Write a protein that binds this ligand. Structure first.
Ligand SMILES: [Cl-]
Ligand SMILES: [Cl-]
Ligand SMILES: [Cl-]
Ligand SMILES: [Cl-]
Ligand SMILES: [Cl-]
Lengths: 444, 445, 445, 445
């Protein structure tokens, strides 16, 4: 296989950029895919019962044509994200509809409109080739990716690229995603691989880390400062765990909300101390399908003050949505910020505007990250200030099982997938920094 | 009669500060009041049928003792605000409860805990006396007021005083309000009277103007810039009218939402061109009492785009609340801001968070104004850039009727009240500036 | 003649995108150029004495190869900027040095390293062709350009593209500038032509207008709000004029500093009332080569308060640098902003830091504009809110003379150049909007 | 002796508020003072040879009358600051001039125009009395102070009180400062004492700590975020030490500049790893009296990049002024911030504006702190996140000597003074939090 020659070049210690340029490209690559004819195979069934092992295929697919500003990457490792799982169960809607509609725009966008969809929105690996107009990345460069795909033809994004109107999430609204031996990305998705991490560790933070960085640290989100009290929902999950790391690393105090004592112990292993178990507390913020219970908002706030010395939180890091959002608005301090990047329990939010207007509060929407924020989030990983949260790794063959585990919230850490890497534990080229941070790296 | 002597000194050309200091203070003053014994007067009645003319009394009341950082003001004119009307009908609760509870804190706070409540949250007049520790205002200074009363003992308010935790609205959570011949205020409520306006015109903008300035113009609100498209609900009302003025004056484009062709004509008089009549279009944002119709959100946004050349608004100036808020979040441009200072149709807001998070929008809460913002809003009036919106003036003795007219939304402009001023049209000391802006000044009449 | 057919398609009513696609491309085009061999023809002479008519040639040059993300544009008109002039006299260094060094990066960048340099940093015209990966612009589209050329490969610029580390100014640090019949630009430089303007009018605002917009209006600069007092140096020049327009249209008060009464009347024609003639007042901010005179700073501050009723400016719009910068820091209000985008009188600034730190002031640097800011500036032109300032127009063959006119500031409006346009007055397709604004459009002629 | 009774109540475990209220006030108190008669006792003498042990007297002085919004505090400990030292040598002017001029305003301000000046701008102690209008503080409350005295009569300060125009620094532009047994402060200067610190430790951070907080952490300064690179001049001094602490505790990376290997070891003791010894490197930023050397600027930039892996600093924490400011502007990253609160080496700054405008940098002035910022900085001390930096402690009698040590930079840590406290080590009320942090608390000695 030409593929074997690529992997052998990576696993050797020695290959120079010209050696990568001179390698023959394979004529196919192994990829985890969805099949267009199966869009409706889950109809009438409840979301919890839909089994991603039944919809995810392991196929050999041809390589796509490389366009300007793009790179073909040999993928050593990837990860499973929530968006991958939703895609794998054809929810909220099949991902093919957008591929087909976008494909009408031009021959280039038509490349993605195929009868199969290669999924995955994280990656760590090695650049094999770059298209026209690219100078900043070369064959051989070790990379991770962020998943924002923006064209930047509209002016709207030129003061923060999340404002670009023509926006796709790579591996979700794009083909040729990361759960595969090769991937196609824009070069403005590439970031330098942290050298103290293995391939699977380096591929794990991207999507959730960068989302939490924009949402909590950056000026485009909550603009955290040291001393702040931060209420963090779901603090042991992917997102919430990065939020907790950001709160502690920036000199602030996270108030961690979890659902079980073992999740509380995960929060403690990250160094949090104020942890609220909402299952043990029994918060019922909604008394109806339609009405909430302000008494319970107030009980949450009192609990928070037990940990803060009577202070209300400066920031709420929201993403459960409707179930918690009314409480989040109520408990926030006068002048404070509720920052939201998801609505996992429901997107129709309801809140008492008296608390927001009369106390000068603010609800700020945030959505993954611009290239600078993604670079900054990954830089904090590379400096050893933020650590990966891997809790289990699967082989590419096993991605269906991996997706299930995420679907059923089976692990608290990230679930990684080896793609071309033949085993865990490869890729580290800074052993000193890794030794410095080893216990934290392995905490999950 | 000591009060007559005070009025005479004001109406005379040329009373000096020492003259005001030498005037004897009367032992009572006439005030529009509520009586503690009547707070249950409107029980079991619909808010529509509650008549302020039955609750508001014209009483002679003694002068309060003057505390540090305070001023006694001879009031020439005041205005009726929504908070005055709500107070006059004992909604959502009687103002007496807060007066009593707050009065426990100290002898100074107990001054306000009386069996009567003098209302009013705007004023224009002349300083008569100042308490201990005051250097910036003197007897004889011509003043308007803003209605934020903050103690500033807590550090919280020292980077924007709206964050002060111990905050009262003068005339609502305080006694000795402006609908009366005299009033007591903190000196950090005083602002210089605009010289081209009459007393009743000068007392007219304070509350709603300053609220709209913070909400739309200042960096603590939406931070308007020229070129922005701004959707303004209820654009002929007091608040919305000031918002429209600020949009135009700042070089932005207001998209005015009104309920009637008459109100649309009012918006045209202010200089607006893009006007949507929600009754002509018949928007139904709510299907149930529980479920909204996104088709109608979309129909609104289409209408807006007809006026803007395909563009979505950078800013939504919200204050109707539940009825409109969903639509407001939906139509806002990617990266845009919904700024809210009230929920007049109801405070339980419901919106689709997908539009907010996925399009990076924000909802910013605002509430009247810090002293700097209130100074800036009044300064724009004094420079002739923003104009009062008086539509009708009453005598102090008929304040009840004034309240009723506000209760029933009878005029689009502010409703003013003469207090000590014997007639309308007095108090102008810059006739040149007045002449330059006279037509705009009178547009709401 | 293939170029003639291109022009005829443009001048005709109604050529469609497919017609432009079908036109044969010429094998050369006429262009104003510098010649690499001549870069020392001014060595050892005073900058004032260097004649651009002696260095600017009119050549037939081959067409460049079109790369990804680029457009070939048929250019109807352009403009002379200060960077064009500095280029034409090989100052501070010859433009060829950078073209050569940058040409070593890739074959694409190597396209610009030629023995001739086609200058020009503004354009108005019609898209002929687009390179690989372009969906937003098509043959036939009427365009103006902004001059920022950024690759956006670094993450640095993805929260404001002015932070990109690899940026070039088109027509100064790139070849194939706008003073020619054809030009090559990135498609992320293209903006829609304002339809009420002629070709030469539409080409004139771009560089200076976008710079002034970022500097004064945007949150990345001074973040103007209505009511602000703004000191504007050189208020009749190219940058100063747009700043004056922005201050007025945003509801603020420009304090216009000029050097002659003729310029003062230009400012009055733009609507400004508070105007200071630095030559009439005789300001000498510098005592000698090394020390300033704070008494003159203070005399300027007193003159400003004569126009503001005792208020110090919220914002100083700086671009003269050393001669004025100490004064600008001094006169700024407590908490105010000095925003700076040039140092035309000298770049070693000297100021008294006591005033900056003890009064919580800030100095903010600004440099042309990101694509969103350039779009917003051009959008305000298209809306009729900001007007072009054309004072004179030359034919492409006369570009040398035109450079000279700018070298010696013979005019205060912009100097435009026709390129393919055979005469002035062509290109208007919104006659009603032009008619509404015609007096202001022509105010500078 | 009434003063002994006050001390005994403090040293007692359990005096209640009513007990402090019942204590008789003494008719005099011991105070470190300057005497008006001796203003010109150092004339023609170089600031180095001026001795504060000659000009500082220890006197018995009557108690001032307590005004509205004020507290009389029994002072257990204080601190020597740079402003104290400048005062003690009558530089740049004698403190008495302002005291007299301000004393001309009212009888309250005339309280401070006395033939003696009690100095001191930090305090830790116990409230004895409060004046009219004070609810938030009571006799018995354990307090530290910040030194901003603002009247807040102007609107200007009501969105950040550092913008107040009528602003004095307590103990410098005010009498009855902290180097004494009793002091008079506005109650809006009072903050809760950190319970894990001794009296002398609690009095030490106030001024320099709040200044560094506003300058580096708050949005009114540089707005630090984790990951930032921060160049910190004078990193072992009073200001620079707190700045290093904030940089580390906020997740940023301080690049600490010091002048000697011993100071470098101090920075290591605070937890910093990247340390440049300006005297080991021998930086010569100025060639002569009037011109600088960009090669030295660049050499500093390259040394910084050795520690950051080739990244330039996001923030420069400036306060040496003229000697370093040019370099500071140059080394700052594109889009970065230079934040300045002093000019100890000279206030006429000279920098090359090309680097500031073409790379979109900003210079932000900062000055001590508003009450919210001072509260936040003291809160970080109370939470155990920022630690006092006491290096040496004197008795009130030795205050003269203390000033001298600070005048000659004898000590890197803050220099503290016991006032009423009989000895060191007293006042700790949270022994477990102290035990948790004891190594850090004592790191400077
Ligand atoms: Cl594509
Ligand atoms: Cl009170
Ligand atoms: Cl190029
Ligand atoms: Cl000044
Ligand atoms: Cl005083």
């Amino acid at each position: 296989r030409h593929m074997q020659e690529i992997l052998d070049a990576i696993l050797s210690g020695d290959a120079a950029s010209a050696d990568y340029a001179a390698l023959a490209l394979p004529e196919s690559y192994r990829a985890v895919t969805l099949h267009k004819g199966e869009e409706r195979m889950f109809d009438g069934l409840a979301s919890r019962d839909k089994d991603p092992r039944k919809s995810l295929h392991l196929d050999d697919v041809p390589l796509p044509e490389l366009g300007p500003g793009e790179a073909l990457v040999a993928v050593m490792a990837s990860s499973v994200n929530y968006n991958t799982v939703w895609s794998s169960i054809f929810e909220p809607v099949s991902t093919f509809g957008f591929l087909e509609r976008y494909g009408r725009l031009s021959p280039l966008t038509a490349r993605h409109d195929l009868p199969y969809h290669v999924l995955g929105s994280d990656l760590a690996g090695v650049v094999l080739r770059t298209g026209a107009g690219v100078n900043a990345w070369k064959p051989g460069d070790e990379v991770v990716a962020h998943c924002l795909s923006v064209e930047l033809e509209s002016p709207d994004g030129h003061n923060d690229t999340m404002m670009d109107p023509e926006q796709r999430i790579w591996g979700f609204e794009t083909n040729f995603g990361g759960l595969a031996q090769l991937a196609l990305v824009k070069t403005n998705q590439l970031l330098p691989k942290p050298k103290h991490l293995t391939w699977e560790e380096a591929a794990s933070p991207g999507l959730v880390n960068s989302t939490a960085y924009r949402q909590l640290v950056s000026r485009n989100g909550a603009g955290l400062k040291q001393g702040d009290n931060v209420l963090i929902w779901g603090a042991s999950g992917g997102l919430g765990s990065y939020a907790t790391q950001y709160a502690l690393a920036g000199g602030a105090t996270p108030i961690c909300v979890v659902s079980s004592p073992r999740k509380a112990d995960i929060c403690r292993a990250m160094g949090a101390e104020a942890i609220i178990d909402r299952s043990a507390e029994g918060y019922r913020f909604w008394k109806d399908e339609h009405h909430q219970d302000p008494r319970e908002w107030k009980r949450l706030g009192g609990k928070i003050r037990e940990f803060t010395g009577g202070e209300d939180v400066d920031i709420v890091f929201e993403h459960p949505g409707r179930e918690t959002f009314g409480a989040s608005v109520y408990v926030t301090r006068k002048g404070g910020t509720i920052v939201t990047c998801a609505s996992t329990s429901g997107y129709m939010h309801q809140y008492d505007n008296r608390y927001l207007w009369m106390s000068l509060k603010r609800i700020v929407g945030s959505h993954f990250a611009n290239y600078r924020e993604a670079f900054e989030a990954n830089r904090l990983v590379a400096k050893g200030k933020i650590h990966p949260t891997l809790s289990k790794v699967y082989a590419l063959e096993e991605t269906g099982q991996a997706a299930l585990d995420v679907h059923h919230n089976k692990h608290q850490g990230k679930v990684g997938v080896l793609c071309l890497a033949p085993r865990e534990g490869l890729g580290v080229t800074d052993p000193e920094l890794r030794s410095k941070h080893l216990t934290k790296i392995n905490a999950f």
